[PDB]
Design a protein around this ligand. Structure first.
Ligand SMILES: [K+]
Ligand SMILES: [Mg+2]
Ligand SMILES: [Mg+2]
Ligand SMILES: [Mg+2]
Ligand SMILES: [Mg+2]
Ligand SMILES: [Mg+2]
Ligand SMILES: [Mg+2]
Ligand SMILES: [Mg+2]
Ligand SMILES: [Mg+2]
Ligand SMILES: [Mg+2]
Ligand SMILES: [Mg+2]
Ligand SMILES: [Mg+2]
Ligand SMILES: [Mg+2]
Ligand SMILES: [Mg+2]
Ligand SMILES: [Mg+2]
Ligand SMILES: [Mg+2]
Ligand SMILES: [Mg+2]
Ligand SMILES: [Mg+2]
Ligand SMILES: [Mg+2]
Ligand SMILES: [Mg+2]
Lengths: 252, 132, 137, 45, 569, 303, 101, 196
RNA sequence: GGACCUGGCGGUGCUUCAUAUCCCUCUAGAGGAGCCUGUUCUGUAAUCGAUAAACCCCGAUCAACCUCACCACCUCUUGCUCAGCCUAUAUACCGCCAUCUUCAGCAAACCCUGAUGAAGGCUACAAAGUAAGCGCAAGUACCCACGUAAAGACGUUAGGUCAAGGUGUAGCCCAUGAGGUGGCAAGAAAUGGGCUACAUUUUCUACCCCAGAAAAACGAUAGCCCUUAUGAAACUUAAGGGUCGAAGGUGGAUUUAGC
């Protein structure tokens, strides 16, 4: 029946089934826009309508309704299928991400420069590194278990200026944006001895984390907790040793 | 919760036209009717035929101007003249717009045995009444 | 400047047959829109006055036809949606107009009848007694 | 006359003057099922 | 309701996007709409069963599918008549052959209709929805074969054969068949005599006297046969006599007087033919002026009805001759004739209408006061037609003549609307007119805005795919306008394009640049201009270097550069 | 923005001239009422919400009051109280406090504007408590013997806030009477009360004791005349249609009271109004609602 | 191409009822009077019973013209309650609005 | 690159143009053609009604721009040729009734749709006051008895409503025939009439 | 394992409340009788779905055949459909909704606090919150500005519906598809809702409210017989009449509705 047909929007909504009790608490399908490659006036009969799918005027004469031969139509359909499969293959293929500390870990991954500020402020000089991504859950009165992302990011210019921030968001990308934008407003400035290391050995305890950092000569490298290596590359420190005792809590 | 012809709220990134933005209970209060005919007046006849014709016309125009209609059609019936006022997008080429206008007029006229006119009003992009 | 020097006039021929006489011409227009009915009333009254026809206007009481349907698809019987259709009226009573005047005026206003407005024109024609009823048989 | 409506719109689609989004969706699903191996069996098997 | 002067013709969608913006787009849009209608009708006639439901009261026959396939398969005269009324040449020929072989009689009228069709269409299938030079009347054709095989041949059969031969340019065979008609002692008709006259003039390249004598003999033969000549006969005579021009001039007037005497009222086609015969290249003032004046006098205020297929060219020809003669009063009279009553429908196809109006408006701009010219411009464009670049150039010329240059921005905007945005000729004309002479500050700033828009159009030209071409005169004029209006920054930025395109700057432009540099106290800019002049090696640069040295205090570096330039000198 | 509003005003002037030309009226004397009438005629919309209907108004009436930028090119704000974020409101409070200090040193016609009105004046968003604070301060100013110098200011925030006797007509015979109407439920009654009479009451051409055989309805008829002490002084002719006996009696009572108002003094009319003899009973049958037995009765709940 | 086999069956029933309406009308008229002989009425009864079953008008079911719903159909528009609500809510039925009073 | 839409043609409209020329007939609201800053649509909070461009609400409105006061006056001036003058003699209802006793009522229904048919158009009503018919006492009494409810004594009017025939002309002829036969029979006398 | 944060819960505390609402208080009811109807159970060869509030005169604004999707038998196979399927999955969904809601909150984007932990963000003589948007409100329909409708977001119950239709997945294709004839659709019994009653503020009659009779009769819309209406088909549907005059005598805890 013609009258029982629906539109692509409604059909895809129903088929994909994003909204629903399943998606309520997580208790795949890809939306393909079937009108992408179709051309107005192109049908399986291979008719050439002047002014719709073929040029109206051919060599100064108004064209007339014509039909592609069977082999020509077969060629056209083959080309259409070729384009469809090429598009599908290029969609399926994915670019290899440059991993951070481990293949599946968000830590150590770059996020790019912080977003430009309002008053003609730009931070293209700054680089952002993710130090942690968590999925913190809080039980709410109505919405059962609620999923949220807490991200720790560190921004720095490699010339002393470096800061860090925690971003909370229901979405990972919003969390990243919040954290990396808040970091640039909370920049420390770190004094580097000869622009490659720290001025003296530092033994400190923040809460239950002990950090023992040793000044080192040029070319020694960063022998530090991977997170400290990331933060030191952001700050601009090239050479330093660092031992982390006690709790290894990333934020502390 | 009432669901009939309501575009449920979102994060504020969903554009909606004036028709979509208004729920059913706003018909005759804030939005008019997309098809005007005498079928539904007291003592008039052929309401069912008019409704079926309207449904077919909407589907046919949607499939004939794919990705061009920027808003719902307006079907006006005066005597036996049928006027389809359609808001469309300035994407398709004017040659194809004219071809399809002539085509639709002729085909619908022969199909429903009545003079059919198709008035296109083009806009650059869908008019956004609000962001839901 | 590019005005038509001469304009062709439509051919109106005075026939040799007597003309109908209309005592009353009650044009009852039904619509869903009071504003549309008011605009049409203004138009028709102005046209009648221009043509010299005597016209009065009344507003018969509206009709509201309501009915009820089940809101839910399957079982929620107690929950309903009630729809209504409003038919608003406007009666233009024209008096003492001839057949030709009635024809021209009706053609005008009917061609200009708005979409969604129906019309019922009752014509009260004046006649004489047939010759076969004048005298007893 | 559902026969008339369906046949007319199908013919218009085949001629290319009517874009049946629903039928395109159904054809896409059928093609994907055919690739997946869910194809309609013949009438004698 | 009169015509809407702000709106394009009604056939177009009344939307700014879909409104045609040129003559080419107007024609193409109308062709596209007609093509869509043709496709719809093709579908309707190819699948009629979807459109057989009649829900119309009163019934509307014109909205019903047309059936072309024959419905009588029985081999009989009735089925052959069905086919012949359907105009199926091949099917009718095959059915006639089959019936003749079967031996059943075929009526003379039926065979005559078969002739009619075959001889008119040249044994070629009439064009359907879907499935010039030379002679098409083939030597061996079904029409001639059936004519020879015909048991009884009649005056109408011979007439139709002759008419078909003439229509398909078989003039010699038509004359022959006329000869056998006479030998068989038959009487032809007025249409056959018209075809025979056409054949007589289109057969051999004989001299005017021979052809005229032949035509007179044919007319005398018609008179003897008592056949009454019609309007078509005389129109064919005049159209054929067009070729001889001067030799045919006076006898054409004789023919027209004969028309008047007989009572066959002359038509627009007749007047068109006479006018075109008399409009030979050379001097029209000798006879064309008088003939056109007399024709207009006669036709004054005469509603016309369609009497000849060629009546729809008289207005085109009249406007052409009026433009040639530069008689604005005669042009106005012709226009009034067109506007009188319903005469406007005789203007003709789109090309004819465009040519008529283009000539009319060019003549108006040439020979009318500027205010009336602008009134006509507004009334005609775009409502009547979409102007040509030449018509816009003539409008600009008229504006210059009348010394009303304050509307040049309006003319440029109208040109952009009508599609002359990227027309080199129009752009050059506008720029030359604007930059020719200085004007008050308001006119100067308006001209500067117009020049900026023209520069934007030049930049955004579709030719950008090809290397951008910027005429040197246009560059000079744009720079001059900017400098005069005070956009010295833009002029200085534009100066680089001179070097970029190797375009020679203008002496006036250089002088204005020097004046601005002196006003601003810019020795660096003065040295830059002098460097450009030296690079282009203009002779005036020799004195301009001294002028700059005198006017502007010269730094040591500037003096060193000037010494280098002088060494180059 | 200001340039946008200026362009809109130019557009409105041109369009107003065009609309005047369209309707044939004089462009010069074309008013906003004329524009509204012309638009209502040309674009008939039956939408119940008047705001949803087509409107061609001045840009000033259409667009909301946009607060102008509050600082210059140098960046310095204009008002010294800018950084409060409520500069206008706090400027008003500061001025009121200064006036109160000066007053302290030296020494049923209107209401207080609503918070919405104050917000509209101050082109700022206020709070309930802010509005209450400002109103308390203004009330203190009013009580503090505010003279003309202060009352001129105060009045900027002040907003300004009996039966209609029918005319006495005369019949052909010169007798004076009064005509009135009254509706009760579905009953509508038209009553004519004569100035002089013997107490006769003819309802629908029938004597009242016959039309209303019910003592309650006769008592209702009596109630107006008995109240004003005019029993037997007036003749009444009533015509009542629709409703039942009690609705008809109530409608006739209201109509009779309204008609008699023309013949009783103003004090008596006010006394009748206070007794409720001139109020149109708005109590009408409440519509049945779907899914329930009646207007308020619900279907028997099944736990 | 109807919505379903039930709608197809109803379409066939309507066609056959239209075809046999006149014959049934005449025979039922013969049967539905006390004037004619009861023997003639009995033969008329057997004829009307012998007519095909689908010609009986009572077997026609008023179904929605768009979803073949056999109940909850508004005769005026020939649409089930669901489809009618869809159209009315979207505003595509002229003059139909939500009722509030 | 792409096609740039032209500026709306309202910019070219003079304030004193010919609006009937602009819109001769009923046509949908065209924003590019209507030179008004008309807005429609319920405004959003602190918003304004949607402008005319793309305004589907204005597109829905059955506008009257083709019927302005000027256009109506001109149209009626043109149509005055088609009108005939009402007989001055019968200037009053009493004269109308006296000269033309029979009144014929027929209704035409103007709806929207491909079919103009309407079964209610076939009904024809014939009204006549018996005082207008030349009937004696006996004939009048017999006519009243024959017609029955069709005769309203209060108004003394006989009303014959004919809808049996498919066509209005047939119904009118049938009503005239009914009047004729009723009159003639009422004048006639039967034998059984004596047993009154 | 220790200490916390958020939520749920407390036969958890104080205070103020519920406005037809939680208890008492007011009116009419159900719970007792017969009948109508739905459901469960039983029965049959003989559907499906809802099934605590939020099912139970519910999908149905409706089942003699059809409707029909059920059963028995028979018949057809490119089949009305460029097939079909009322086949499974509502725990994949769109569509339309119940529910709290007889709520007023949901809130993106920012800022701050907590040592930069989960998290939290208020005091008006104010102490870190600002908030677009949605909702409420406002506006609107009906008879006012009251009232009733309508509206009522985000979420809860994997709440309801694959049997309105569409649809993902899965399943049958000589059948889980299609057509024809016939048939069940009942009561052991329980239970929900409604109608009628048990009467004297009542019953019958006239009238539509100034009467006369009745009164151990009141009380069936049930039972049985007949007739009529619709239909092709009526013991199985409706109406009317005839006949009969049944249970019952104001109903237990409990429970519904109404400002
Ligand atoms: K009870
Ligand atoms: Mg890995
Ligand atoms: Mg609800
Ligand atoms: Mg049925
Ligand atoms: Mg309660
Ligand atoms: Mg009970
Ligand atoms: Mg069940
Ligand atoms: Mg179950
Ligand atoms: Mg069966
Ligand atoms: Mg059954
Ligand atoms: Mg099945
Ligand atoms: Mg669910
Ligand atoms: Mg509600
Ligand atoms: Mg509200
Ligand atoms: Mg569930
Ligand atoms: Mg379930
Ligand atoms: Mg089966
Ligand atoms: Mg009984
Ligand atoms: Mg029977
Ligand atoms: Mg008894």
């Amino acid at each position: 029946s013609f009258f029982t047909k629906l539109t692509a929007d409604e059909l895809w909504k129903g088929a994909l089934a994003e909204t629903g009790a399943g998606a309520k608490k997580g208790r795949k399908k890809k939306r393909k826009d079937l009108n992408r490659g179709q051309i107005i006036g192109e049908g399986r009969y291979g008719f050439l309508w002047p002014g719709l799918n073929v040029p109206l005027m051919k060599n100064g004469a108004v064209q007339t309704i014509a039909q592609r031969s069977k082999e020509e139509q077969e060629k056209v359909e083959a080309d259409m299928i070729q384009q469809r499969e090429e598009w599908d293959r290029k969609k399926k293929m994915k670019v290899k991400r440059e991993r951070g500390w481990s293949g599946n870990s968000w830590g150590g991954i770059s996020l790019g420069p912080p977003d430009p500020g309002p008053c003609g402020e730009t931070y293209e000089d700054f680089d952002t590194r993710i130090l942690e991504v968590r999925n913190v859950f809080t039980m709410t009165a109505k919405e059962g278990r609620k999923k949220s992302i807490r991200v720790l990011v560190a921004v720095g210019n490699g010339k002393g200026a470096a800061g860090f921030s925690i971003g909370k968001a229901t979405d990972r990308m919003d969390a990243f944006r919040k954290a990396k934008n808040r970091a640039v407003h909370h920049l420390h400035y770190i004094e580097r001895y000869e622009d490659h290391t720290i001025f003296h050995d530092i033994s400190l305890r923040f809460k239950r984390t002990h950090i023992k950092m040793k000044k080192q000569p040029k070319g020694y490298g960063l022998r530090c907790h991977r997170a400290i290596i990331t933060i030191c590359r952001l700050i601009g420190i090239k050479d330093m040793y660092a031992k982390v005792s006690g709790s290894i809590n990333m934020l502390s | 919760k009432n669901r009939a012809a309501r575009v449920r709220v979102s994060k504020g990134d969903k554009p909606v036209t004036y028709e979509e933005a208004h729920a059913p209970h706003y018909i005759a209060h804030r939005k008019g009717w997309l098809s005007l005919h005498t079928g539904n007046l007291d003592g008039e006849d052929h309401a069912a035929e008019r409704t079926v014709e309207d449904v077919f016309l909407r589907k046919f125009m949607w499939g004939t101007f794919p990705g061009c209609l920027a808003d719902q059609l307006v079907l006006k019936r005066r005597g036996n003249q049928l006027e389809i006022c359609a808001v469309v997008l300035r994407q398709l080429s004017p040659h194809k717009y004219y071809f399809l206008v002539g085509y639709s007029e002729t085909l619908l006229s022969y199909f429903y045995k009545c003079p059919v006119r198709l008035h296109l009003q083009t806009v650059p992009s869908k008019v956004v009444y609000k962001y839901l | 400047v590019d005005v038509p020097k001469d304009l062709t006039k439509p051919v109106v021929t005075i026939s040799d047959e007597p003309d109908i006489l209309y005592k009353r011409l009650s044009v009852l227009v039904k619509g869903h829109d009071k504003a549309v009915l008011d605009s049409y009333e203004y138009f028709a009254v102005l046209a009648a006055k221009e043509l010299g026809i005597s016209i009065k206007v009344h507003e018969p009481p509206r009709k509201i036809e309501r009915f009820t349907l089940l809101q839910s698809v399957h079982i929620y019987k107690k929950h309903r949606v009630q729809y209504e259709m409003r038919t608003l009226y406007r009666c233009l009573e024209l008096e003492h107009l001839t057949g030709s005047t009635a024809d021209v005026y009706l053609e005008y206003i009917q061609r200009n009848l708005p979409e969604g407005v129906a019309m019922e024109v009752t014509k009260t024609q004046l006649e004489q007694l047939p010759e076969h009823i004048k005298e007893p048989i | 006359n559902h026969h008339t409506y369906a046949e007319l719109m199908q013919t218009l689609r085949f001629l290319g003057l009517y874009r049946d989004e629903h039928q395109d969706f159904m054809d896409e699903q059928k093609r994907l099922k055919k690739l997946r191996g869910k194809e309609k069996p013949k009438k004698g098997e | 309701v009169n015509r809407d002067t702000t709106a394009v013709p009604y056939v177009f969608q009344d939307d700014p996007y879909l409104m045609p913006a040129s003559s080419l787009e107007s024609r193409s849009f109308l062709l596209a709409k007609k093509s869509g209608e043709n496709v719809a009708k093709f579908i309707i006639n190819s699948y009629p069963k979807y459109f057989q439901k009649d829900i119309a009261e009163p019934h509307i026959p014109c909205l019903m599918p047309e059936y072309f396939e024959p419905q009588i398969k029985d081999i009989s005269e009735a089925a052959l008549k069905e086919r012949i009324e359907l105009r199926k040449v091949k099917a009718s020929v095959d059915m006639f052959d089959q019936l003749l072989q079967a031996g059943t009689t075929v009526s003379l009228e039926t065979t005559n209709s078969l002739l009619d069709l075959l001889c008119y269409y040249g044994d070629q299938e009439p064009s359907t929805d879907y499935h010039q030079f030379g002679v098409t009347w083939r030597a061996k054709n079904n029409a001639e074969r059936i004519f020879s095989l015909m048991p009884e041949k009649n005056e109408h059969s011979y007439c139709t054969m002759i008419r078909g031969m003439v229509k398909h340019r078989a003039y010699e065979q038509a004359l022959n068949l006329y000869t056998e008609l006479l030998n068989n002692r038959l009487h032809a008709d007025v249409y056959t005599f018209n075809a025979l006259i056409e054949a007589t003039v289109c057969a051999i390249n004989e001299k005017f006297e021979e052809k005229w004598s032949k035509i007179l003999e044919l007319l005398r033969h018609m008179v003897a046969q008592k056949v009454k000549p019609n309007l078509q006969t005389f129109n064919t005579i005049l159209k054929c006599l067009r070729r001889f021009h001067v030799f045919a001039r006076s006898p054409a007037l004789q023919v027209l007087r004969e028309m008047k005497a007989i009572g066959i009222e002359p038509s627009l086609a007749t007047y068109h033919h006479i006018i075109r015969l008399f409009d030979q290249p050379g001097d029209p003032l000798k006879r064309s002026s008088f003939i056109i004046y007399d024709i207009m006098n006669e036709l004054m205020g005469k509603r016309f009805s369609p009497k000849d297929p060629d009546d729809d060219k008289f207005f085109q020809s009249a406007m052409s001759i009026c433009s040639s003669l530069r008689d604005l009063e005669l042009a106005y009279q012709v226009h009034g004739l067109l506007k009188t009553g319903d005469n406007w429908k005789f203007i003709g196809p789109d090309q004819h209408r465009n040519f008529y109006y283009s000539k009319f408006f060019d003549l108006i701009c040439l020979m009318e006061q500027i205010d009336v010219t602008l009134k006509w411009y507004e009334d005609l464009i775009p409502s009547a037609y979409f102007p040509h670049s030449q018509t816009m150039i003539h409008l600009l010329q008229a504006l210059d003549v009348a010394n009303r240059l304050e509307v040049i921005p309006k003319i440029w905007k109208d040109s952009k609307e009508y599609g002359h945005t990227f027309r080199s000729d129009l752009r050059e004309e506008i720029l030359m007119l604007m930059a020719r002479d200085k004007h008050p500050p308001e006119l100067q700033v308006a001209f500067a805005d117009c020049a900026a828009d023209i520069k934007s159009a030049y930049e955004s030209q579709p030719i950008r795919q090809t290397a951008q071409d910027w005429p040197a005169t246009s560059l000079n004029c744009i720079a001059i306008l900017f400098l005069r209006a005070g956009r010295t920054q833009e002029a200085w930025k534009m100066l680089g394009l001179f070097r970029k395109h190797n375009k020679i700057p203008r002496s006036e432009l250089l002088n204005e640049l020097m004046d601005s540099a002196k006003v601003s106290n810019s020795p660096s800019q003065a040295i830059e201009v002098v460097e450009l002049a030296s690079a282009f090696s203009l002779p005036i640069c020799e004195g301009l270097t001294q002028r700059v040295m005198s006017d502007f205090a010269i730094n040591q570096e500037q003096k060193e550069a000037l010494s280098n330039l002088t060494a180059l000198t | 923005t200001e340039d946008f509003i200026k362009k809109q005003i130019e557009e409105f002037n041109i369009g107003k001239r065009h609309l005047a030309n369209m309707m044939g009226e004089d462009p010069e004397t074309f008013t906003q009422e004329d524009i509204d009438r012309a638009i209502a005629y040309l674009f008939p919309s039956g939408l119940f919400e008047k705001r949803a209907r087509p409107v061609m108004k001045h840009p000033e009436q259409i667009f909301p009051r946009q607060r102008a930028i509050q600082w210059g090119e140098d960046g310095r704000p204009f008002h010294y109280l800018f950084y409060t974020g409520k500069q206008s409101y706090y400027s008003l409070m500061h001025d009121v406090y200064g006036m109160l200090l000066n007053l302290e040193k030296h020494q049923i016609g209107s209401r207080w504007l609503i918070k919405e009105e104050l917000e509209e004046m101050l082109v700022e968003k206020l709070s309930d408590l802010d509005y209450m604070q400002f109103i308390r301060l203004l009330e203190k100013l009013l009580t503090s013997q505010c003279g003309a110098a202060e009352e001129e200011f105060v009045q900027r925030f002040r907003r300004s806030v009996k039966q209609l006797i029918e005319p006495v007509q005369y019949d052909e015979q010169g007798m004076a009477f009064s005509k009135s109407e009254g509706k009760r439920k579905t009953a509508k009654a038209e009553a004519i009360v004569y100035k002089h009479g013997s107490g006769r009451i003819k309802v629908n051409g029938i004597d009242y004791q016959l039309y209303f055989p019910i003592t309650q309805d006769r008592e209702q008829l009596m109630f107006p005349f008995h109240f004003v002490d005019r029993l037997g002084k007036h003749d009444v002719t009533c015509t009542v249609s629709g409703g039942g006996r009690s609705a008809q009696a109530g409608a006739i009572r209201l109509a009779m009271a309204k008609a008699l108002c023309s013949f009783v003094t103003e004090d008596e009319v006010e006394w009748m109004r206070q007794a409720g003899l001139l109020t149109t009973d708005p109590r009408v049958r409440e519509r049945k609602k779907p899914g329930q037995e009646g207007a308020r009765r619900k279907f028997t709940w099944k736990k | 191409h109807y919505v379903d086999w039930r709608m197809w069956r109803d379409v066939k029933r309507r066609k056959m009822a239209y075809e046999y309406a006149d014959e049934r009308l005449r025979i039922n008229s013969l049967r539905k009077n006390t004037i004619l002989p009861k023997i003639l009425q009995d033969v008329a009864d057997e004829e009307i019973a012998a007519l095909p079953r689908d010609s009986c008008p009572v077997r026609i079911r008023n179904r929605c013209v768009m979803t073949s719903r056999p109940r909850g159909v508004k005769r005026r528009w020939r649409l089930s309650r669901i489809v009618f609500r869809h159209l009315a809510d979207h505003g595509q039925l002229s003059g139909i609005q939500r009722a509030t009073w | 690159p792409r096609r740039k839409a032209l500026p709306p043609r309202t910019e070219k409209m003079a304030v004193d143009q010919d609006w009937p020329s602009v819109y001769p007939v009923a046509a949908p609201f065209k924003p590019s053609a209507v030179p008004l800053p008309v807005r429609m649509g319920y405004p959003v909070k602190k918003g304004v009604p949607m402008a005319k461009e793309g305004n589907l609400e204005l597109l829905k409105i059955p506008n009257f721009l083709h019927l302005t006061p000027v256009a109506i006056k001109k149209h009626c001036e043109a149509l005055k040729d088609f009108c005939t003058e009402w007989p001055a003699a019968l200037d009053s209802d009493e004269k109308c009734e006296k000269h033309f006793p029979i009144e014929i009522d027929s209704t035409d229904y103007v709806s929207s749709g491909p079919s103009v048919r309407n079964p209610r158009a076939r009904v024809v009503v014939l009204r006549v006051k018996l005082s207008s018919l030349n009937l004696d006492d006996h004939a009048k009494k017999k006519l009243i008895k024959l017609v029955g409810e069709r005769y309203c004594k209060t108004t003394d009017v006989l009303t014959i409503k004919t809808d049996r025939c498919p066509l209005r002309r047939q119904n009118y002829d049938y009503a005239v025939y009914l009047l004729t036969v009723l009159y003639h029979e009422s004048w006639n006398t039967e034998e059984w009439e004596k047993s009154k």
